[PDB]
Every structure is written in structure tokens, then in C-alpha cells.
């Protein structure tokens, strides 16, 4: 079954060229056209160019002529794209996608590499626990939370009880202020089961090698 594999994110310094990768498997890499497409955050989609791996015949958008260079290595089944002299207009998700056999349509897609072009400094989050207010419970449910404060760049991952607690969860979009991100998560559980069942947020910020499991105490 055909797989198209791209790294999840990349932090690139302004002006320093970066090479994205798309590893193909589950079919004959040299048989089909590979396309790349740009998607700026919260925005629409733009076609960058395509390459044919058998001989590296290429067609580029005029809009990307002096920005993208497309290559492959046949022996590794890998498509690549170089973005020259990166600016903040180059921050986006970049996807690779390949065509249907005997067709012109983009049936198979990668999961996209998130590129952030920024001079700002990589920074670890703080993980703070949001335990309920003072007093006895009078409703059928309890809401607890987790605050992830002041990290850079994106992303972080957050789970509840190793991911064994997944329903009733709201993890909110990060907010960038100055050059640091902050997000929070909430979890609702039936009030009969807390504090008798312990609740823990699991937070990872892989840019800073941060892995924290914070227990919510009453």
C-alpha cells in the first residue's frame, strides 16, 4: 500500500537554504509524477512544480522559478525540494503528492512538513497544572486542565493519562506573543471518579527534548 513519508516540522534560519524530503514506498517510485504544494498557515493551496523520477524531467510554476529546486534519488525512493535563501514568506506546510496511474489527479498525499523561518530562539515550555477551585462538588462532572507556557517553535504534543483518556478533552490552538507560544488543555470526567482516579497531562516539546508528565493534585 502506497506510502508518502515526510518529516513533521523544520526550524530554518532566515537566508539559509533548507532541503525537504518525501520518501516513497508501496509502488515503483520511477513510474509516476511527483508534485509539491505549498499551504501557508490558515490559508489556501498553491502548486509549486512536478518532477518525473525516471529521468528527472521537471515542470516548475513561474511563481517558484527562483525559489524551488526539485530532485530525486532513485536508489532511496526519495523526492527532494530545496528552498533557496528562506524568508518569512517561506513559512508554510509543504506537501508532496503523487498522481493516479493513468490519470492526472492527486490521489496520494504526504502528511506535510511544517517549516518555520525564524531567527527566534528555541525554548522549552513550562507545564503548570489547573486543579479545580476550592470546595465540595455539586454537579455530575469535574473539569481539570493543563497549561503549556512559553515555548518555541511549534509543535507540542499533549495527552491525558498516556492517551487512555481521550473523550471529553479540548486542547486549544497555541497563541504566539512576542516570540513564544502558549496553549492549554481541558478534560472533563464524571465527578464520582476524581480524585479516586488520578489524572495526568503528558506534554512533549521535541524541539527542546522536553517530555513532562504533570499530575493534577487536589
Amino acid at each position: 500500500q502506497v506510502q508518502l513519508q515526510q518529516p513533521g516540522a523544520d526550524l530554518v534560519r532566515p537566508g539559509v537554504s533548507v532541503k525537504l524530503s518525501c520518501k516513497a514506498s508501496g509502488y515503483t517510485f520511477t513510474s509516476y509524477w511527483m508534485n509539491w504544494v505549498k499551504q501557508r498557515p490558515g490559508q489556501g493551496l498553491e502548486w509549486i512544480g512536478m518532477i518525473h523520477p525516471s529521468d528527472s524531467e521537471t515542470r516548475l510554476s513561474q511563481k517558484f522559478k527562483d525559489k524551488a529546486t526539485l530532485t530525486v534519488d532513485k536508489s532511496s525512493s526519495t523526492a527532494y525540494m530545496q528552498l533557496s535563501s528562506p524568508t518569512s514568506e517561506d513559512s508554510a506546510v509543504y506537501y508532496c503528492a503523487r498522481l493516479k496511474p493513468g490519470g492526472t489527479w492527486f490521489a496520494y498525499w504526504g502528511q506535510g512538513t511544517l517549516v518555520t523561518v525564524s531567527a527566534a530562539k528555541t525554548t522549552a515550555p513550562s507545564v503548570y497544572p489547573l486543579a479545580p477551585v476550592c470546595g465540595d462538588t455539586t454537579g455530575s462532572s469535574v473539569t481539570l486542565g493543563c497549561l503549556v507556557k512559553g515555548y518555541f517553535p511549534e509543535p507540542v504534543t499533549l495527552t491525558w493519562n498516556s492517551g487512555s483518556l481521550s473523550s471529553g478533552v479540548h486542547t486549544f490552538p497555541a497563541v504566539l506573543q512576542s516570540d513564544l507560544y502558549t496553549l492549554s488543555s481541558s478534560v472533563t470526567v464524571t465527578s464520582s471518579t476524581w480524585p479516586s482516579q488520578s489524572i495526568t497531562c503528558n506534554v512533549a516539546h521535541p524541539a527542546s527534548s522536553t517530555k513532562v508528565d504533570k499530575k493534577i493534585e487536589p
Binding site: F106, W109, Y128, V133, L147
Partner: protein
């Protein structure tokens, strides 16, 4: 170099009803009696997912609730009936002539019965009160419609700056919205005050939902 004009830009439909999404090419996208026009579903944090190819052909794995029609320059995506899980942005894309250009997208929201928010205020953690920074957090959870007003009070008095709001995408089962509201202050400022309030005004009631705390209670 073909422009695709997608309409409407956003659309709210009720569960069980049909959705109609359009797309118009600046020139003909046809060759030899086929139209070189695709449709995609894109859900937050995912790649676009192919629904229809060649104007009308339903991609494998895709439910027949989705259909496409049109020729030359005018094309139509219909979804019918619309289900909870159809929250997405949908995009047309021409494959007739490169650059292989996309519509601007159509955001689909679900109409559902009005629900009131569940509100929950959180004093700054002990741990954080060690930083000389303090965050008061308030969750407004699972409400409908999306339109909500939030108000912070410190010692009875309304406060404007230092407050950041963040909203989830429409939930794909219950079709509701949720929100977080954070008030950040110095530790200094936090402790010069004794009462903190998070106040929500929403469609569902004329009186606001007030949830509050007194410091060191």
C-alpha cells in the same frame, strides 16, 4: 494560467440537509469530452483528501453522499445528506493545464440546536506563582452558536488588556464550539487583588454565566 473562483466562501448547513458548493474556471478545463476538475476535503491538521476526480467520478473509499457535476467552466460539489463529520474546508483543483491551480476553499459549518457553555475558572498554580508571573485560565466548553462574549472582573472592576482568547474547530461529533480565555499578570499584581471573575454572555441566556473565586479561600 487558469483562475478558479469558489463560492460561497463559508456555508452553514443543518444535519440531514444537502450542501451545494461551486467553482468557476476562467477558461475551459475540458479535453476530448472529459473535464479536468477535482474536489478535495481537508480537515484541520491533515492533507487534502481526494473526493471526486474528472468532475464526476467518485474516488474509492469515499461514500456516495458526495457527488460532482458540470462541464467546460462551471462545476458543482453536492453533499447529501450532510453528517456531523463533514466539518471541513473543501477545495476544487484543475488538472488540465499547469500551474495546477486550486479554488480558494469553502469552509463548511454544521447547524445544530443552541447549547449553553460549561464555564470553569482556575487560579494560578502554586508552581507558577514562583515565576513572578500569574495566569488565570477560564474554559467555556461545548457551546452553540460560535458567537460568545467573555468578560473578566478584578475586585468587581472590568479589565481589558492582558487577555488572550483561543477557540477550537467545530467538534466533529456534537458540533459544538469551545474556548479558552487566559488573563496573565505579574505575581505582584495578582496578589494586590483578592477576587477574580470570568463572565460569559451567550445566546442561550439573558443573564451571564458567572464563575468566580476569592484568593486564599
Amino acid at each position: 494560467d487558469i483562475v478558479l473562483t469558489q463560492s460561497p466562501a463559508s456555508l452553514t448547513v443543518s444535519l440531514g440537509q444537502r450542501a451545494t458548493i461551486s467553482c468557476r474556471a476562467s477558461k475551459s478545463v475540458d479535453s476530448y469530452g472529459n473535464s479536468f476538475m477535482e474536489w478535495y476535503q481537508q480537515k484541520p491538521g491533515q492533507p487534502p483528501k481526494l473526493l471526486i476526480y474528472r468532475a464526476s467520478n467518485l474516488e474509492s473509499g469515499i461514500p456516495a453522499r458526495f457527488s460532482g457535476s458540470g462541464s467546460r467552466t462551471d462545476f458543482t460539489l453536492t453533499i447529501n445528506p450532510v453528517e456531523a463529520d463533514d466539518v471541513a474546508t473543501y477545495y476544487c483543483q484543475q488538472s488540465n493545464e499547469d500551474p495546477y491551480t486550486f479554488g480558494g476553499g469553502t469552509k463548511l459549518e454544521i447547524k445544530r440546536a443552541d447549547a449553553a457553555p460549561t464555564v470553569s475558572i482556575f487560579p494560578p498554580s502554586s508552581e507558577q506563582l514562583t515565576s513572578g508571573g500569574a495566569s488565570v485560565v477560564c474554559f467555556l466548553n461545548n457551546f452553540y452558536p460560535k458567537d460568545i462574549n467573555v468578560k473578566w472582573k478584578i475586585d468587581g472592576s472590568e479589565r481589558q488588556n492582558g487577555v488572550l482568547n483561543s477557540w477550537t474547530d467545530q467538534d466533529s461529533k456534537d458540533s459544538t464550539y469551545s474556548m479558552s480565555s487566559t488573563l496573565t499578570l505579574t505575581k505582584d499584581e495578582y496578589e494586590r487583588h483578592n477576587s477574580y471573575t470570568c463572565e460569559a454572555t451567550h445566546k442561550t441566556s439573558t443573564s451571564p454565566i458567572v464563575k468566580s473565586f476569592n484568593r486564599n479561600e
